[PDB]
């Protein structure tokens, strides 16, 4: 698997750029220019445009602290690559800023920061993402919260872009579908070991598992008094493992409408 | 409960111009009031004396006689069913575009029928508008009557051979599906693959004429090089 | 997605630009690019002055109107549909033999219909291909979308009397049953009825240009013990 | 014409041997081990080994799902027998894997599945013929699409085995054999014994069953504990006798919408 990597500092400070030798880029066919795509832990997925060093080993990637932060990873980590040759070009965008960084500005962000930092920049972003600007004398944060189309976009001369808005906080409601995992479960040993010796193969390689010709398991229930917290426990196993857990709740199944529930 | 007033309100600003006018224009050529020669648009009449009024009404008249209704029948059945979804949906919060690219198509379907040697017009601007409605609306599923799973961007070339092998007249709906696609290139599909400059911007004196909704994300910039 | 592109290219060679050829060239010829008098296969003209511009493409012209839409589109359906059949059987591996037959049938239709007036040579090289399928399938029970029981061997005469209620030139059918019957008595009757030398050879020069697929062995290995 | 005989289930699971009584043997100067021929419906040939076994009566064959499936007949039916002693040694066989048993295998498999079961064996085979070999999870099964000479041959030591190539898709017959049949059911003897009784007639001859005037049973109900393998008696009678097994589900009819149902 020629797709694991293992990180490092870098030398250039453009957000949207990663040092690559060239071997490796001769092995991935890769040329300048192009984009893709980056994803690590937590689920948190990234586009960059790949850039030539001779200096930075084969097995180690070049890149920037920003990108760091937004994939959730740290230094020594494993970090894959893909090609991304489909990626399109966008039509309009709405970007916002963090609250603990428009203190005492006072004034219109198109022209100060955002027009000088898109302009003939070509730079690829996702939704989602936490990105800087360095303007006058501070460090403005930014984050982006649609694109379209979604959730791929290049930026072009001809695009609306729309920073009207009240500062957003930094997270709010992103902690639930995040770090959460085994470090926040406690009193079920036994049964979280279970559940991860019952579930953890057919997820983590599904094709696999299809490959030998075994029945997977289909339902599992998981009783006992109410309150221990069973929803974290499944929540963690698919945040873990990786997946796409999606909740139902019984009440608001129950009473929508009649006959559409 | 007077449905006529209702369901005339109920239809949107732009069609609901439109819809009418083609289904006005001909009265006045059945009744005979105005002399149907007059109402041709002759190409040569049109290039040597003034003959403006020719493009402007030629393109709202057919005339309907023994058993030629039924086409345009389903057409303006076609034209009404269709624009409401074109308006609604896509072209919905830029009414200025909407009645921009039927003054593009309308230009071009003029000048190509200038240059051929057509008498009527309205057939493929509408073979057009459909043509740029299905090519936005890819991947879906519908049905006519019979139980048939047609999915998308084959409709204007299923009733292009339905027009085809049920009578003839082809050159009236390629010469519509030509003008649609050569639109949605320089619309949508030229500045989103390549990242071209735009060619076609609306005017701002359209949009004083006629003023836009307000868009949810407030309002917004063009960046430009 | 292309779905007409991979059906098209799932179609063989021989058949798909067979039928590429007859769904093109009506189509220009009623655009109206070359006159649809240029190509009829006029005899006299043909007998007294050269004129190698029409022996050929009168056999893959029709001039389609509001008459004939549902002959053309049951012949063109019946073409594609027995085609392929007929590629999968019998001529599955030697596409040579299949140029071979379809250039005897073309070539003995076109001099029968230089004696004969017929003017459009497209129905009896179907209905040829169609009279030697049936009779090397004999004894098999075919059944159309809603047919019960009908056996084979019969089809062409039930297409004989549909082409000659729905339209008419019943002699230019009679005479493409006539080309298939003699095709398929000097090509695989003549052998086991004679024994002699089989009349009907392929040149080598269709060999040249499509060599037979045969088998391809690979690589194995030795079982032992 | 002391030839036609009455297929019946074998207790052979060897896919290339036949039980016979000892009259017929005597009768049909058929010696233990040697080669016969086989003719049935729609003109389909097939080749066995003679096997002596007192349990089968004189009129009837016992043969297992390969070779009855081979000859494209069911259970009661009727086929033709003779002697064929002049089958020569083969020199080499083309062999291919049918598509939908190899999907993701990605290995040899020459020495996993075809030497091991080829091996001091003598198996007859035939063009066209198809076969199944058990492996390690799965049950493969190959078409052979070339022989020398053509069509009897006999498998020997020194023999050039191809087996590399497209896979084949479905010959579009069905018979697909990774359905359920007699062989499939255990621990019920004597129930599945008396449906067999009681369904035959009416589902094997429709006509003599009409033209004798007796009224045939027009339902049945298969009670027992849930889990205990009924709907696989069902298909494995409707796909045994022949029909066009249709099932109905209690809860698709029951909540499908409000009078609809
Ligand atoms: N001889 C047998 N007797 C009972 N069950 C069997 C037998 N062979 C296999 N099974 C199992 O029974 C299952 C099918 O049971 P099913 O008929 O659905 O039960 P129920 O009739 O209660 O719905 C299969 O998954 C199979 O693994």
């Not at chain 1, 920049?121 to 996702?126: E, N, T, V």
């Not at chain 1, 360095?134 to 984050?143: D, Y």
């Not at chain 2, 092998?165 to 010469?175: A, P």
């Amino acid at each position: 698997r020629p797709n694991r990597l293992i990180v490092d500092e870098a030398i250039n400070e453009d957000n949207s750029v990663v040092s690559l030798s060239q071997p490796k880029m001769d092995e991935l066919q890769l040329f300048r220019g192009d984009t893709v795509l980056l994803k690590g832990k937590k689920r948190r997925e990234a586009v960059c445009i790949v850039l030539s060093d001779d200096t930075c080993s084969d097995e180690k990637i070049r890149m920037n602290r920003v990108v760091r932060n937004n994939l959730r990873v740290r230094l020594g980590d494993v970090i894959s690559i893909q090609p991304c040759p489909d990626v399109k070009y966008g039509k309009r965008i709405h970007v916002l800023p963090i609250d603990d960084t428009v203190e005492g500005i006072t004034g219109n962000l198109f022209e100060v920061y955002l027009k000088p930092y898109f302009l003939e920049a070509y730079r690829p972003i996702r939704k989602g993402d936490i990105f800087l600007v360095r303007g006058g004398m501070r460090a403005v944060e930014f984050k982006v919260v649609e694109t379209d189309p979604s959730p791929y976009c290049i930026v072009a001369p001809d695009t609306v872009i729309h920073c009207e808005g009240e500062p957003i906080k930094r997270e709010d409601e992103e902690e639930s579908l995040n770090e959460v995992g085994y470090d926040d479960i406690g009193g079920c040993r036994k049964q979280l070991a279970q559940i991860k010796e019952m579930v953890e193969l057919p997820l983590r390689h599904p094709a696999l598992f299809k490959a030998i010709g075994v029945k997977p398991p289909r339902g599992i229930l998981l009783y006992g008094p109410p309150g221990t917290g069973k929803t974290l426990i499944a929540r963690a196993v698919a945040n873990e493992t990786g997946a796409f857990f999606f909740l139902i709740n019984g009440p608001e199944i129950m009473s929508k409408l009649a006959g559409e529930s | 409960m007077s449905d006529i007033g209702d369901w005339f309100r109920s239809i949107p600003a732009i069609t609901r111009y439109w819809f009418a006018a083609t289904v006005a224009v001909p009265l006045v050529g059945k009744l005979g009031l105005i002399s149907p020669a007059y109402l041709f648009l002759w190409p040569e009449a049109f290039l040597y004396r003034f003959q403006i009024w020719r493009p402007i009404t030629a393109t709202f008249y057919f005339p309907v006689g023994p058993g030629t209704g039924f086409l345009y029948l389903v057409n303006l059945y076609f034209l009404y069913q269709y624009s409401t979804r074109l308006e609604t949906g896509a072209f919905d919060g830029r009414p200025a575009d909407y009645l921009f690219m039927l003054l593009f198509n309308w230009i071009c379907i003029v000048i190509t029928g200038l240059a051929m040697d057509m008498q009527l017009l309205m057939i493929p601007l509408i073979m057009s508008v459909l043509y740029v409605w299905a090519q936005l609306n890819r991947d879906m599923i519908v049905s006519f009557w019979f139980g048939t799973r047609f999915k998308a961007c084959y409709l204007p070339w299923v009733i292009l051979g339905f027009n085809y092998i049920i009578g003839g007249s082809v050159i009236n709906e390629l010469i519509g599906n030509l003008v649609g696609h050569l639109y949605f290139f320089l619309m949508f599909r030229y500045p989103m693959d390549l990242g071209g400059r735009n060619f076609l911007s609306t005017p701002q004196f359209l949009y004083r004429w006629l003023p836009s909704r307000r868009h949810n994300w407030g309002q917004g910039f063009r960046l430009g090089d």
